Write a protein that binds this ligand. Structure first.
Ligand SMILES: CCCCCCCC/C=C/CCCCCCCC(=O)O[C@@H](COC(=O)CCCCCCCCCCCCCCC)COP(=O)([O-])OCC[N+](C)(C)C
Ligand SMILES: CCCCCCCC/C=C/CCCCCCCC(=O)O[C@@H](COC(=O)CCCCCCCCCCCCCCC)COP(=O)([O-])OCC[N+](C)(C)C
Ligand SMILES: CCCCCCCC/C=C/CCCCCCCC(=O)O[C@@H](COC(=O)CCCCCCCCCCCCCCC)COP(=O)([O-])OCC[N+](C)(C)C
Ligand SMILES: CCCCCCCC/C=C\CCCCCCCC(=O)O[C@@H](COC(=O)CCCCCCCCCCCCCCC)COP(=O)([O-])OCC[N+](C)(C)C
Ligand SMILES: CCCCCCCC/C=C\CCCCCCCC(=O)O[C@@H](COC(=O)CCCCCCCCCCCCCCC)COP(=O)([O-])OCC[N+](C)(C)C
Ligand SMILES: CC(C)[C@@H](O)CC[C@@H](C)[C@H]1CC[C@H]2[C@@H]3CC=C4C[C@@H](O)CC[C@]4(C)[C@H]3CC[C@]12C
Ligand SMILES: N[C@@H](CCC(=O)O)C(=O)O
Lengths: 99, 43, 414, 241, 98, 51, 49
């Protein structure tokens, strides 16, 4: 049952601006088989597996460029920098003596 | 955004524990001079 | 447009302005489900009599029954596009004109057609401001209660060993009473205590103590005036620019009047999508309630017309408008599309702008300034801020009243 | 320098509290067993005052134990008084109240400038709406304005700084831009932005034309969409705002 | 001599000068002088540390959105490297024409 | 007057004037003490400004 | 504040037989930590306050 939702966000606005400039139409659809992508038993799933199996042309979202994916799918230029970062709660500040 | 200044500083001990080290050091140092000046008087 | 009940006779009560001219009042026929003849006067009415006199027409002023300014509600439960409020009455033939603060909007301009604005204004935010509360122990605040004890405790520890370092040093000494007054008069910077500590050791300890007492007092007095009055830093909002207002947080409640121009402005804007949803929950039925809601700290901000919000800040001084203006669309006299009076209404509005009639209307009704305005002057410590320290001196006399008896009875005992 | 405290707060510390504390010190010392010259009420008032102003002034201290305790309490108060007084002493003492020489278009300096001090030198660029409004409204003031007619905004802008002209009367929108875009932030508009004869701009379409309805709706669309706010920030913003 | 040390000792908050005024009239003038010498010192020491360092604020640029950067001026000179990416970033931009 | 009292008098002037110092006698020494008092006024102003 | 966030890439002509092997080794060296090591030895010095 292909129920219809409403999609918006940072990447969607980029997709709209791209569509006007490159003059192409689109029909987004969310994933059902996994997310983003992972080569399980040699098969790509998620957002990156639906471009591999020719189910769609592009995968607009939070996909990160890496060597493993770029060998099976063509990645555009990075429209935002990301990476790996560690998130922790703040520590207890200590006022140094002799202040 | 830039963090606003955190006013209403209650100024607990940990803020001022350095000063009490100075008073504690003088308390110990003055005792040493007290012992030192007794040795000077004795000899 | 002020609305007041009429007298028992059924006629408006006679009142005069500050200048001495009689105030022109018009008998309305608005609701309380029951329509009663009320009394109306104000800026828009005063302009209405001028319009009637020059353009030679009579009138029957009646308040809107719906109570709303006007918004497009094509409710799909009935599948009909209907206007609610003064906009609905004008288009339905109930009223031939809208002499009221009707914002010139694109949505309304399609159906009804306005005139030249008689009041250029915009949208601003009204808040409750910040009342600086004062306690009786505000002067005990700059130090935590724990190091208040250590400050006092260290006075006696130093005083005891100042006397011990003088009684037993090889060497007019320093008695226990004179040591307490030294270590207390140094801390409080009072003249009492004239016996400097003898001995090399007590002089070292009695001079580091003076430096300790200087840092202790300096850090106590570094921000004392801030604790006495207290204040929330900056202001609550500074217009629609800060992240505190971009997204809801359930702790800051901002809303406007239901079915008004502010509703359409936020609904149509694409960036202000979370603002509209937050406002949709707490949107008020009338502006007067929203002004009153801010008063008893249940509404944190009120986005309304700058012409009205600024008037409230002048009258009730506990409210201060904040933020720059936006959606600068003025008040026009609405009329239907045909409107044989349109050409003459705008010309009389334009001419009365240049004649100074509107400026006279602003002075009589809008420009009051009952309370003091805002400035960058620092706060002056008033009676309530300093009431804590007055009970410290007063309690220093009552304590001495019971202390003197102990001292007298002590000599007799010894 | 008397602004850091309210007037009634000023009174209590130094009329009510100081007198009562001075009497308390004198009374405690009078009944104290251990109480040089005898302590008097004048010495108590002199001692309490000196404690308020740091402790530089020479004083005579009491001899009773409880009298010194009361003085210690007053010393703590004197510590608080100086802390709160001197916290904003500099801030209060640099406040400047810039007073304008004129109030508005209805000022007597504008309507009847001859029968006054050395005459006000005000003028405006002719052949505009500002001169037309002054022509119709203020007949006497317009005639005096004819001698000081300028040639443009830029020419009149520098005549204000040099001193040949005192007041320049012109469009609010242009003058706000000139005030905002200025060197030294010295040129200001009277009334803190007060605007007389409030009108607006507008595309002067041909009389009885079908484009007026669509142009009006297009302009109002820019207001609702917020495009007008962006345009004002791009063009009508200066360093003096 | 003892009157000079009273006025100077009060002004400088030093113990120099132990002779308080004796008469009523000299005691009034000698205590208002203490208040004068307290405001004068307080206003002197209110911002002394700022004059010692002598730091001029409003010199750091908040970014490309700084109003002083928006308009040209002979007092403030800002530039880039010729024939680089920054040149074609500002050339292509519409708002940054000045 | 000795030299311990001179050091005690100078130190006490640095920490306001709370302690009971012994003052010198003579114009020249009292002028020097007054100069040090002005320094002690500056020291406290600079130290306590950002304490 | 940073603006025009466009990074440094190797330039090559359109043909460029080394088109994809250059980018793949850049991506791999990003994940290998090679560029992080390059930053430490060349860009991250931090001489003073
Ligand atoms: C520059 C220095 C020169 C002079 C130095 C002199 C040094 C002399 C030293 C003296 C030691 C004095 C220690 C207490 C200091 C008061 C602060 C305090 O406790 O407040 C409390 C606030 O509580 C209130 O808000 C209500 C009560 C306020 C007054 C406290 C009574 C003190 C009683 C004794 C008075 C003794 C007087 C002497 C007679 C024996 C804070 O602590 P809490 O209770 O955990 O707060 C609860 C939190 N809550 C409020 C948010 C709910
Ligand atoms: C001698 C005469 C007094 C001297 C005072 C000296 C300091 C002067 C500073 C005064 C500043 C105010 C401090 C308290 C403020 C917070 C508390 C509050 O609001 O309620 C309190 C008000 O306060 C009092 O009734 C007096 C409090 C005295 C504090 C010091 C006592 C030291 C005792 C040390 C003993 C240590 C152990 C000793 C043995 C080793 C009490 O509340 P309540 O009674 O429920 O009624 C509320 C009043 N109301 C209804 C009007 C609102
Ligand atoms: C910066 C913030 C604050 C700013 C404002 C505040 C700062 C300026 C404030 C200055 C005030 C200075 C007061 C000094 C007190 C001297 C007392 C004295 O000499 O007493 C004498 C007698 O006197 C008495 O017996 C009466 C005591 C009250 C005198 C009040 C005078 C006020 C004059 C107006 C003051 C206002 C002037 C200021 C405005 C023009 C002598 O004492 P005795 O003989 O030892 O004792 C008598 C006992 N016997 C009779 C038994 C012997
Ligand atoms: C909201 C609250 C606000 C509070 C604001 C407070 C502001 C500042 C207010 C007041 C401060 C000034 C008064 C306090 C000091 C009095 C004593 C003194 O100086 O000398 C005593 C020394 O006494 C001794 O020899 C015994 C030592 C203990 C005495 C002090 C106990 C604590 C007093 C409480 C301290 C606070 C509690 C500390 C808690 C850790 C007197 O000696 P004596 O033997 O009686 O002399 C007669 C004998 N002779 C003739 C032989 C000489
Ligand atoms: C944030 C604030 C600033 C930073 C903190 C600062 C805190 C404050 C720190 C320190 C203050 C210390 C004050 C010392 C007082 C001197 C007077 C004295 O001791 O009297 C004696 C003088 O002794 C002598 O005769 C020798 C004098 C040489 C110097 C002695 C003191 C050095 C101690 C250094 C120890 C440093 C300990 C520091 C620990 C931290 C005896 O006096 P007298 O018998 O009359 O002398 C006769 C002279 N005759 C012998 C020539 C005849
Ligand atoms: C009882 C006697 C021994 C003296 O203390 C007696 C000292 C007493 C005469 C002084 C002292 C302080 C004075 C006030 C200071 C500030 C102001 C604010 C200003 O805006 C108006 C004047 C006012 C209120 C002063 C009035 C006089 C004043 C109370
Ligand atoms: N954004 C990542 C998934 C989130 C993560 O970094 O773990 C991806 O596209 O594979």
């Amino acid at each position: 049952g292909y129920i219809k939702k409403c999609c918006k966000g940072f990447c969607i606005d980029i997709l709209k601006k791209i569509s006007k400039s490159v003059k192409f139409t689109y029909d987004l659809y969310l994933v059902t088989n996994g997310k983003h992508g992972k080569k399980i038993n040699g098969t790509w799933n998620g957002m990156i597996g639906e471009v591999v199996m020719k189910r769609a042309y592009m995968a607009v979202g939070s996909l990160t460029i890496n060597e493993e994916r770029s060998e099976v799918v063509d990645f555009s230029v990075p429209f935002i920098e990301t990476g790996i970062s560690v998130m922790v709660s703040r520590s207890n500040g200590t006022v140094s003596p002799s202040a | 955004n830039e963090k606003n200044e955190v006013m209403s500083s209650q100024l607990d001990i940990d803020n001022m524990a350095g000063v009490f080290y100075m008073l504690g050091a003088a308390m110990a140092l003055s005792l040493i001079t007290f012992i030192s000046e007794h040795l000077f008087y004795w000899q | 447009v002020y609305v007041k009940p009429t007298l028992s006779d059924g006629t408006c009560k006679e009142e005069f302005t500050v200048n001495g001219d009689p105030v022109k009042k018009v008998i309305c026929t608005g609701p309380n489900r029951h329509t009663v003849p009320q009394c109306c006067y104000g800026f828009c009415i005063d302009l209405l009599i001028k319009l009637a006199r020059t353009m030679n027409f009579t009138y029957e002023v009646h308040l809107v029954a719906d109570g709303k300014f006007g918004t497009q509600e094509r409710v799909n439960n009935s599948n009909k596009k209907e206007w609610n409020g003064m906009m609905g009455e004008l288009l339905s033939g109930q009223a031939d004109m809208i002499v009221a603060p009707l914002t010139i909007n694109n949505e309304r301009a399609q159906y009804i057609e306005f005139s030249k604005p008689f009041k250029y204004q915009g949208l601003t935010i009204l808040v409750k401001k910040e009342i600086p509360r004062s306690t009786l122990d505000s002067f005990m605040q700059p130090f935590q209660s724990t190091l208040w004890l250590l400050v006092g405790l260290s006075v006696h520890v130093v005083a005891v060993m100042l006397y011990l370092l003088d009684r037993f040093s090889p060497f007019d000494a320093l008695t226990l009473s004179s040591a307490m007054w030294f270590s207390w008069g140094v801390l409080l910077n009072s003249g009492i205590g004239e016996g400097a500590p003898r001995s090399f050791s007590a002089r070292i300890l009695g001079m580091v103590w003076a430096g300790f007492a200087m840092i202790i007092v300096a850090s106590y007095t570094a921000n004392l005036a801030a604790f006495l009055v207290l204040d929330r830093p900056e202001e609550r909002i500074t217009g629609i620019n800060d992240p505190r207002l971009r997204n809801p947080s359930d702790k800051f409640i901002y809303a406007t009047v239901k079915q008004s121009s502010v509703d359409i402005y936020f609904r149509r804007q694409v960036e202000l999508s979370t603002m509209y949803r937050h406002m949709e929950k707490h949107n008020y039925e009338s502006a007067a309630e929203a002004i009153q809601a801010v008063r008893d700290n249940k509404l944190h901000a009120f986005i309304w017309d700058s012409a009205v919000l600024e008037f409230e800040a002048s009258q009730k001084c506990d409210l201060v408008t904040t933020g720059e203006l936006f959606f600068r669309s003025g008040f026009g006299i609405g009329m239907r599309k045909d409107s044989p009076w349109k050409q003459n209404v705008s010309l009389s509005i334009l001419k009365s702008h240049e004649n100074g009639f509107m400026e006279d209307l602003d002075k009589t009704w809008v420009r009051y300034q009952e309370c003091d305005s805002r400035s960058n002057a620092p706060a002056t410590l008033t009676f309530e801020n300093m009431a804590g320290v007055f009970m410290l001196v007063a309690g220093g006399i009552v304590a001495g009243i019971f202390l003197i008896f102990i001292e007298i009875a002590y000599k007799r005992h010894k | 320098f008397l602004e850091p405290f309210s007037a009634d707060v000023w009174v209590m510390m130094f009329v009510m509290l100081l007198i009562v504390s001075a009497v308390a010190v004198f009374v405690f010392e009078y009944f104290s067993p251990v109480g040089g010259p005898s302590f008097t009420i004048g010495k108590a008032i002199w001692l309490l005052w000196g404690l308020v102003f740091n402790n530089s002034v020479p004083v005579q201290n009491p001899k009773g134990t409880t009298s010194k305790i009361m003085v210690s309490v007053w010393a703590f108060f004197a510590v608080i008084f100086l802390a709160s007084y001197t916290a904003n002493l500099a801030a209060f003492m640099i406040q400047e109240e810039y007073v304008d020489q004129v109030s508005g278009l209805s000022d007597k300096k504008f309507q009847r400038p001859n029968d006054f001090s050395p005459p006000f030198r005000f003028g405006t660029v002719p052949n505009g709406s500002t001169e037309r409004n002054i022509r119709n409204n203020y007949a006497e003031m317009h005639a005096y304005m004819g001698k000081f007619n300028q040639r443009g905004v830029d020419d009149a802008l520098l005549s204000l700084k040099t001193g040949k002209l005192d007041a320049f009367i012109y469009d609010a929108a242009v003058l706000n831009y000139m005030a905002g875009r200025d060197e030294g932030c010295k040129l200001v508009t009277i009334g803190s932005g007060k605007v007389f004869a409030s009108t607006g701009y507008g595309i002067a379409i041909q009389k009885d034309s079908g484009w007026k309805r669509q142009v009006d709706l297009a302009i109002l669309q820019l207001f609702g969409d917020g495009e007008m706010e962006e345009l004002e920030a791009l063009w009508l913003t200066g360093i003096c705002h």
